[PDB]
Amino acid sequence: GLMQFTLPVRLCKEIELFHFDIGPFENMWPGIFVYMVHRSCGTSCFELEKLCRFIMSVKKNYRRVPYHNWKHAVTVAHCMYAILQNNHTLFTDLERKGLLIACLCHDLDHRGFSNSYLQKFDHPLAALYSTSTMEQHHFSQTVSILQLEGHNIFSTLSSSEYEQVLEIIRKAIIATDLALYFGNRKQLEEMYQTGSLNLNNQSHRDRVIGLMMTACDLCSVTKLWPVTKLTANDIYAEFWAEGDEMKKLGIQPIPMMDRDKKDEVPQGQLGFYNAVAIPCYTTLTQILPPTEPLLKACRDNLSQWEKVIRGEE
Ligand SMILES: CCc1ncc(C)c2nc(CCc3nc(N4CCCC4)nn3C)nn12
Ligand SMILES: [Mg+2]
Ligand SMILES: [Zn+2]
What we know:
Homodimer. With about 325 residues, the chain is mainly alpha-helical.
């Protein structure tokens, strides 16, 4: 009730910045998350006992894969926190509650494989969920954990507030399917420019929350260069394992997933910043001016990938 979470001074300060790294101390990650909910949402959003038990069940249902792990979940939630704190007055009480939870839960029980590989392997999830296969799974795992005895952190919301929050979380999690992102950003691009973007239109909020989700999910490209470069090693460690598995099914993987194209990583990173990252943070900054530090950090890391291609590092 009177029990604030504090962080050591360097974290207490650096956690407010977009580029904050949550560090290698796994055991501090829960407290970092609780700290961020408490400042973002207030100390009264969740019963602490329930929140702690929910965080620990979420943790247990992330797998020890090189990239889509518990560290990624808490990274994507810290970026959402940064966005929320810098756009204080644009979001509802329920949106602040829901989105930090959505981000912690967005990759629950990920196996290190793309929706594509699940479809070619003919994994059972691919017959339960024909598109956004893993993302429909992540949402389903969220609801499961919320239904555990003692884990309903939303148990004080009205019957209809509860339904609104689970609907924000579902759309938020589905929007992390990067196949949906391209169309979502194109439509936001058009509506912003033609002046039709309206934050009272619920379907517009949805789009804008979807772009925030993609921005948070891609936030490794917005870190200090050494964080960005070492996270790319984890990202390709999964992709290349998937490439291996594709070759086991008799299928040439795409170059992104072929470890025989190690040499081309720098140029693949350029494609990705140009096709995906920069456009994402550009459109995000237009709609939400105070997120510009994500665009500016992303541009910095593109320029570092340019330097790598030129032998300069
Ligand atoms: C959400 C996906 C994602 N989030 C963050 C990051 C940093 C990220 N990087 C990549 C791979 C990008 C890429 N690599 C290649 N290569 C490598 C050598 C030949 C082809 N092609 N492409 C397009 N995805 N990704
Ligand atoms: Mg995902
Ligand atoms: Zn993710």
